[PDB]
Amino acid sequence: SILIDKNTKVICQGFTGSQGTFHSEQAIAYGTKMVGGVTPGKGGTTHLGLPVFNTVREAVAATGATASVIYVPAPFCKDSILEAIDAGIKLIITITEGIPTLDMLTVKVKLDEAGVRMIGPNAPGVITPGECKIGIQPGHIHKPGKVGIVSRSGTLTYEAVKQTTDYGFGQSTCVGIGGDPIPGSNFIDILEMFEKDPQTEAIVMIGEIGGSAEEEAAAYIKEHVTKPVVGYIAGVTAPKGKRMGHAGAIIAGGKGTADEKFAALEAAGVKTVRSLADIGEALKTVL
Amino acid sequence: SILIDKNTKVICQGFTGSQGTFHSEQAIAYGTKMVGGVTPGKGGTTHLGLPVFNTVREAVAATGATASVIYVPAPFCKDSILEAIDAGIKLIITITEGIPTLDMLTVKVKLDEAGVRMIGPNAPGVITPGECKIGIQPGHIHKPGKVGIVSRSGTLTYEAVKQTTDYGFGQSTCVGIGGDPIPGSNFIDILEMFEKDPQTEAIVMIGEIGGSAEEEAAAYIKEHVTKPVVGYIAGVTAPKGKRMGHAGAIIAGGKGTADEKFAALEAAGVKTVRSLADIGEALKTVL
Amino acid sequence: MNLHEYQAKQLFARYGLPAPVGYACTTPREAEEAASKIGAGPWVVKCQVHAGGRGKAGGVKVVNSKEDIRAFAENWLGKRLVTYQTDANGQPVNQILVEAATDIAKELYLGAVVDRSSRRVVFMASTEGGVEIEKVAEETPHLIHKVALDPLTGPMPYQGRELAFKLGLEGKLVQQFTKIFMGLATIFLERDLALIEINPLVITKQGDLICLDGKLGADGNALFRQPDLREMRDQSQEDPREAQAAQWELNYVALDGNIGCMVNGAGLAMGTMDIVKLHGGEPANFLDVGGGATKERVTEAFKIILSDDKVKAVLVNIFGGIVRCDLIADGIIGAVAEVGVNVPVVVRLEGNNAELGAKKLADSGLNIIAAKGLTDAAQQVVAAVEGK
Amino acid sequence: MNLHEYQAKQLFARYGLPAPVGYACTTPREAEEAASKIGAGPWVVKCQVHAGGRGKAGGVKVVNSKEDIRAFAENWLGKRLVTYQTDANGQPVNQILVEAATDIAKELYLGAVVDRSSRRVVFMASTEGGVEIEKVAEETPHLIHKVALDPLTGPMPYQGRELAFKLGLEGKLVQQFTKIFMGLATIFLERDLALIEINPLVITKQGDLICLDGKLGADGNALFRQPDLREMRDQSQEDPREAQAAQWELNYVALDGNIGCMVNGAGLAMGTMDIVKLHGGEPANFLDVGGGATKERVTEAFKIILSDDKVKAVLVNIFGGIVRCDLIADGIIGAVAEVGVNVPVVVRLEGNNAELGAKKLADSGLNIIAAKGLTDAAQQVVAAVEGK
Ligand SMILES: CC(C)(COP(=O)(O)OP(=O)(O)OC[C@H]1O[C@@H](n2cnc3c(N)ncnc32)[C@H](O)[C@@H]1OP(=O)(O)O)[C@@H](O)C(=O)NCCC(=O)NCCS
Numbered sequence A, B: 001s002i003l004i005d006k007n008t009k010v011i012c013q014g015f016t017g018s019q020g021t022f023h024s025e026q027a028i029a030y031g032t033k034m035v036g037g038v039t040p041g042k043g044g045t046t047h048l049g050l051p052v053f054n055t056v057r058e059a060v061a062a063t064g065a066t067a068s069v070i071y072v073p074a075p076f077c078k079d080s081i082l083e084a085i086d087a088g089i090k091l092i093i094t095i096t097e098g099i100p101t102l103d104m105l106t107v108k109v110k111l112d113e114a115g116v117r118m119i120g121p122n123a124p125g126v127i128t129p130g131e132c133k134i135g136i137q138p139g140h141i142h143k144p145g146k147v148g149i150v151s152r153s154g155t156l157t158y159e160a161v162k163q164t165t166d167y168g169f170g171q172s173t174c175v176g177i178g179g180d181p182i183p184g185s186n187f188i189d190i191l192e193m194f195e196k197d198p199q200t201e202a203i204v205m206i207g208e209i210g211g212s213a214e215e216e217a218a219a220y221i222k223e224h225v226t227k228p229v230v231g232y233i234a235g236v237t238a239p240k241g242k243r244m245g246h247a248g249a250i251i252a253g254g255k256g257t258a259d260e261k262f263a264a265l266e267a268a269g270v271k272t273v274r275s276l277a278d279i280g281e282a283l284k285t286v287l
Numbered sequence C, D: 001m002n003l004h005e006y007q008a009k010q011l012f013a014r015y016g017l018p019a020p021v022g023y024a025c026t027t028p029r030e031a032e033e034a035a036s037k038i039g040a041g042p043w044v045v046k047c048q049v050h051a052g053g054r055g056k057a058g059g060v061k062v063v064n065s066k067e068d069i070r071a072f073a074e075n076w077l078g079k080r081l082v083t084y085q086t087d088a089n090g091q092p093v094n095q096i097l098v099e100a101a102t103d104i105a106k107e108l109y110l111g112a113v114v115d116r117s118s119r120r121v122v123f124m125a126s127t128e129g130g131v132e133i134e135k136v137a138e139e140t141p142h143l144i145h146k147v148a149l150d151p152l153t154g155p156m157p158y159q160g161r162e163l164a165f166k167l168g169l170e171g172k173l174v175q176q177f178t179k180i181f182m183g184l185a186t187i188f189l190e191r192d193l194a195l196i197e198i199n200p201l202v203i204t205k206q207g208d209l210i211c212l213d214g215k216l217g218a219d220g221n222a223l224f225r226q227p228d229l230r231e232m233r234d235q236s237q238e239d240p241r242e243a244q245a246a247q248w249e250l251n252y253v254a255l256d257g258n259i260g261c262m263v264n265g266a267g268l269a270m271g272t273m274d275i276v277k278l279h280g281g282e283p284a285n286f287l288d289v290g291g292g293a294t295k296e297r298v299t300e301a302f303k304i305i306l307s308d309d310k311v312k313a314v315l316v317n318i319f320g321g322i323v324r325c326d327l328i329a330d331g332i333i334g335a336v337a338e339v340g341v342n343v344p345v346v347v348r349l350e351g352n353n354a355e356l357g358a359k360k361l362a363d364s365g366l367n368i369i370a371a372k373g374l375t376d377a378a379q380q381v382v383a384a385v386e387g388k
């Protein structure tokens, strides 16, 4: 498994908010070691039976959490993420959607220099089935297993999750890197982690239109990934230069079409599948 | 020797200016492999028999210079240094005085991330006697030798240079790190380089009031410098909170007095000398 | 979010960038009156629509008599302009930009975007102005020069000069280019732009740099802190269903086909469309429910989707979400009854009560098939349009 | 470069930071008239001098009658205020700041400087307001909280809250503190400040944060791009010889002693002073020639140095530079003749023609000893004042 496990101590920024509350309850029910939360102004209180702190630094001192899930509205995310980075949190899962691209541009530069890992934003989160759940994904469709999944899409990941549970392959870890143009972590970052993870036997890489993370990931896979990779790209039928929901799902300058990514993946030796319904089948094949 | 040698290929930014011209002529006469210069607007011309380029990148492509000496007025230095860093120059000697502290603050962060070394600003330069001369220092008082010198002051370095030539010790390399509050390189940076340099047998560290580079360097010396170090700090008789010439020569908050630095150096086992006239004598002693 | 050329030019003005003298007029009378405010002809009259290729569609003309400005404004105001960059329906011309004629000596290109591969705002300059920049990138890549804004330092003058010298500019044109770069890069950062495109950036016969055109794209995600840009939104330039859907927390994007798609998740939405495609279908739209599929939301979804005549079936693919599968089914049922959906509706449901919600759909009586899995769902919606 | 409290407060205003209602008055009449513009007494009247400790020197008073404001202004305008932070000569009071009385509930400290050790602008906050911050740093270090501005991102709100929560602030005071931090950090970056000190930053009885005082220090090196600050310079607050020297490209700083020092190089200057000290001397000043020691420059140097009566000898220590040692000697000779230097002058010369310039000095007849080396030079200047 990668990124998180049964031992990951997580705090939640925006903990006392609707989504922060609702999804922490789910995390807690799954056994994620949520150990606290941060909401400026409610430090010193308790919520979901955990301590609430005014700052991430008070929360880290107090709990030793090394991971933080962020449910802060977009306007305050840069601030939140930067506060976490500054407090020593080593892993940030940012669920928030709508963060200005220019903010993520800066954040990403920061994340890299501070050596902090961020999954997101505009992401569903991360889950190591049976061990840890951070995010908004539905835990009941997962099955502890051997397939690692990385995707720019939440729902499409679930489809792949369902399939890998229904073929009995299970999932080692699922990483939703999010649908924003400048994510904190990209396919190559996560792919490298799956390659080095004994528990992960095969990889499902789910992409879509826009950018070139998939094309670069292909190049990377050919050269450094040895485990088998099944891939799927959404947006074959997407018009160019129109945002398809996710901020990053947009073909800018006629570059980054689904076909290009498919082809680039095929060339790198990745087992691509045209229908998302056949991800499971394709795994069976190279498994 | 450190930083530069007979093989260092240097370009000069502000090359066609008064100081850029005058001091490049001196460099050239000393044998420094000046290979060109940059002055936006005069690319394509020649000056001092060297090619003049419009940008540092054109100059580096053309000459392979890995070092750049900057003689650009203060208002344009950030721009110059940043342009050099971006062009791949690995060593920047900035003579310019008057660069806003906030500019050097940013530059310093950049220099460190890009892995570029900068000696200065507000510095006299660097000279490896007999091999390379970059800067405004007078080459005739130097003597190829075994003593490495680092100083926040130009003139005080000359005094130490004179002494080490007059005791026949000679100099391995002289690094004037400059008198600004946020220098590109500091005592610890240079000290480490002298420790690892076979040719340097002893070190003369010249400081002054302000900051805490000397105190930190002391701590560093105790722990990682094995060669003998003679030290001298100027400003024993300097009022507090008044700038004594160099932008960085100012006791802010009653911290950073000459005595504190002397004592901190003494404690770290450094041979300090109260009169700058006895630097040579003190070397003889630990030599 | 796109701005009009006249708006981009106001902005450029505000940042001391050079642009022609001109006024955005909303009536033929204002337009003809703007001529004299401008001066000696001839004058350039340009329809203001977000799309490009206005030139090749006759929406840009250099006229030399007020009577001409008027005729042009009369011909276009209230009419829709169709360019190769708009759908066949075109975009409404509500403003005519009347500017001074400019003496073009040479045409350059200067633009900027967020480069996702290098994770930086990147400015791009070319001597190939007046041309589609993609075409130049295709064919003469060595003529496109780029610089990446350093997030730690902000745009730096040497980057502007770098581009200037690579464009072979010289003399005062270099200083002028640098100014334009510094300001465009400043605007990019301060207004949270997503895109800047000056095509062409012109060197005038009098030897000065001028922004003959301007195309600004704002980052929608940043509009909350861009009040000025916020007010500049011209809703008439887009399919109204998009803004309509947005108030309802739906992401709608009209397509050509006849199979409406309603899905939660952008990824699942695109993937759903593709599967309908793979199975011989033709997706009519992208509609991502994404926000909790409440009953009313689904109703809205249907109204928006079906507001397109070409729609002859609607595929609903919902995997998970906040509402349980049976509540989702009721809403589909309720929306189909109420909205009076007259088309077959195929529904794929996954999650808690998937089967109970499937049953509810089957027992409704309404023409709503509950698919058993995604591949099935597709084949059924595809089949459901055969003939219709 | 220092600003006056009233100037800092204007600046704070400009950035939406809260400061008392007040007016800088230059006549007793304006001062007494400002009372009514302010409102109900009592009013705070404060001499405006760059130094601090104005309070302990009687330059700050809370009066309750216009007749009092007047008396105060009359007592101070045109007079010089001496505080523990000025020399015995004090600083001229040319403005009296008349502000509204403030209801102090608690006194905090908020300030910022460039921390050379961490190479960042660092804000510092303490509940120990009204106290010398150094004292608090000495004794209760755990009460001083700090944040470092990240050069890559600019000041961030969480840093302001960090400090706010460490100060135990709560409720609206946290938002208010954050605003003040964000703006002070913005001012710091935008005006190229070197220092900001709000002491005290007050929580008023009505429960609001207010800047009771303000001390801004600008980075002199950045004044070329700070036109506003440039105009705010009040030359009368410093020894005039300093600005005088500066136009001449000399760095002058008056001291107590009687041995004038003229040296090229700040480092050599300080070191020279120290050597004169080591050898039983008492340096009267720091004067760094640094710019080419032309004859006229040296003449200026002498005028400035000798403009101090306490000076009973002048040591000239010149090592290298742009002018050759003999030309330097002529200028010293010329300056000593012309300026009519009536004191012994000891000269240390190193570089090309050091001896030829020494000869020229010896053959002048003038009372100018040419030292042979630095230690010698010192002993000779020290000796040269013995008795004088
Ligand atoms: C992040 C998001 C879910 C937050 O929504 P929300 O919970 O309804 O918002 P709320 O206002 O209820 O809660 C936000 C909380 O953040 C808090 N907050 C604000 N700034 C904060 C900061 N810097 N640090 C910590 N908490 C902060 C507020 O205190 C608020 O909680 P409160 O109600 O106790 O005051 C929402 O903005 C969003 O982005 N949704 C899209 C998620 C998504 O679609 N992801 C894609 C994965 S497929």
Ligand SMILES: CC(C)(COP(=O)(O)OP(=O)(O)OC[C@H]1O[C@@H](n2cnc3c(N)ncnc32)[C@H](O)[C@@H]1OP(=O)(O)O)[C@@H](O)C(=O)NCCC(=O)NCCS
Pocket (backbone or CB within 6 Å): B013, B014, B015, B016, B017, B018, B019, B020, B038, B039, B040, B070, B071, B072, B073, B074, B076, B079, B080, B095, B096, B097, B098, B122, B123, B124, B125, B136, B153, B154, B155
């Ligand atoms: C750097 C310094 C010496 C420059 O002074 P200068 O040579 O008289 O200034 P000039 O105007 O003659 O020359 C500057 C040149 O920089 C050039 N320049 C400006 N911006 C430039 C840039 N970004 N890149 C390259 N060159 C640039 C100009 O073109 C000019 O040359 P030109 O005359 O051919 O147009 C001066 O500003 C300074 O800082 N002096 C103090 C040095 C010092 O005391 N150091 C302490 C060590 S002890």
